[PDB]
Copies of this chain bind each other. A is one copy, B any other.
């Protein structure tokens, strides 16, 4: 058997680019139509980012030789500025003016998930109505292609120009083609501005050297969705056919050799026998109406009997079949089976904890490697704009300017939705005993709950002096 399977060895791009468009189209159709795909991308959406995505700017004061309190004040100021800028009601951060930063990150992670990559473009608006003119717009991967759909080359593959080392020098972006009555035009976009500002951002997860376009996960499960749908239809037809009923009022006659003799007689000149017998039968059963139910039983020719028979007649094993499938697809997306299919039968407590822990580990990995990088990119661009306009002031004794040490100034970490608590008491006991036994400190317990210790402490102070001001027990 194994001797019949000899797949050739090609580089990842060689095995991806020729069918890249068809794979993306198949993934888009599958997510649009199939319910489980929508569910899975929804879990990805609600878990990688959560309800909100909060910045925390931790500048490297030690590297920059900056007083730690000065760094803290600077981080507080930039955090306030970013907070007021990001959640603006006008959606001015988006060129399209219909999304805010949270669903910015959401769209980014979702489109990376179902397409393998994400592309963002930072534009410099000219309108002075806002203090910040930096806006962001996403580009669907399908809009990135070679101009005029020309064949790819060594340095031009799938619309992205590469150097000798494979680094992306720029991209070819195609305009939208709707309605399909106009040719698409391709525009060249450099990857980054001459001043080092990130004009265009491409984020994806590569698996090997030289890969230029990400591959969506759905590549490993499409056929499984297909056998799932075929199984659903087959189960439907089985239910139909096992509710099928046939009843005929047949007559035997057709006396073998005398049947042949009657055939000869009727063919020669004696169709009158058949016609008269048919008429008599029709008259009798028009007098009869022999109705099995609400309908009348059809009548058959003499010697003609309905013969319907079926295949083997055991149980089809549908339940275990689709259990095994749903498990296969759940492994394909790496999410827990009991949440993708939301089947929770006979599930224990510790076992549910293990499932959630595995999914959560995967999810934290993706959040760290996908959402965090992209968000850091927007934050760096925005903070560069802010320093340009002196909205936030750098420390006077800065060892390096911002341009020289963009990473040092922009060192930031992002906190999404915290860990959802399976039982409540167990996790709070973890938190309290960890904080009292010295193995943990406030920032992380606020971290796996989505909060931060700064505002928590300030709010505890406010609650305290309000309560003592009102005479309540502190």
Contacts and interface: CB of A to CB of B under 8 A. Distances in A.
A437 B264 CA distance: 104
A260 interface: yes
B7 A25 contact: yes
Interface in A27-49: 28-29, 32-39, 42-43, 45-47
Contacts of A345: 346
Given A14-B177, A256-B253, A410-B89, A308 B472 contact: no
Contacts of A438: 435, 442, 456, 460, 472-473
A205 B267 contact: no
B250 A307 contact: yes
A237 interface: yes
Given A210-B176, A243-B235, A472-B461, A331 B35 contact: yes
B84 A35 contact: no
Contacts of A281: 301
A98 interface: yes
Given A11-B177, A32-B220, A439 B445 contact: yes
Interface string A98-118: 111011000100110000000
5 contacts: A2-B222, A50-B365, A237-B243, A246-B308, A337-B342
A66 interface: no
A327 interface: yes
Contacts of A35: 220-221, 224, 328-329, 331-332
Interface in A345-363: 345-358, 361-362
B344 A355 contact: yes
Contact of A457 (B13, B29, B152, B472): B472
Given A32-B219, A176-B210, A26 B7 contact: yes
Interface string A315-352: 11111111010011111101011111111111111111
A165 interface: yes
B34 A210 contact: no
Contact of A352 (B350, B437, B466): B350
B422 A357 contact: yes
Nearest to A119: B209
Interface in A140-173: 140, 142-143, 151-154, 157, 165-168
A415 to B, nearest CB: 13
Given A239-B321, A241-B243, A261 B262 contact: no
Contact of A207 (B107, B310, B423): B107
Nearest to A246: B292
A457 B89 CA distance: 31
Contacts of A143: 209
Contacts of A29: 7
B422 A242 contact: no
Given A179-B152, A340-B331, A467-B457, A311 B242 contact: yes
Interface string A167-187: 110000000111110100000
A7 to B, nearest CB: 4
A441 B470 contact: no
Contact of A39 (B262, B334, B340, B365): B334
Interface in A281-333: 281, 284, 288, 290, 292-293, 297-322, 324, 327-332
A227 B231 contact: no
B284 A301 contact: yes
B253 A303 contact: yes
Interface string A119-138: 00000000000000000011
Nearest to A343: B327
Contacts of A311: 241-242, 244-246, 308, 310, 312
Contacts of A339: 354, 358
A450 B235 CA distance: 46
B51 A80 contact: no
Nearest to A446: B439
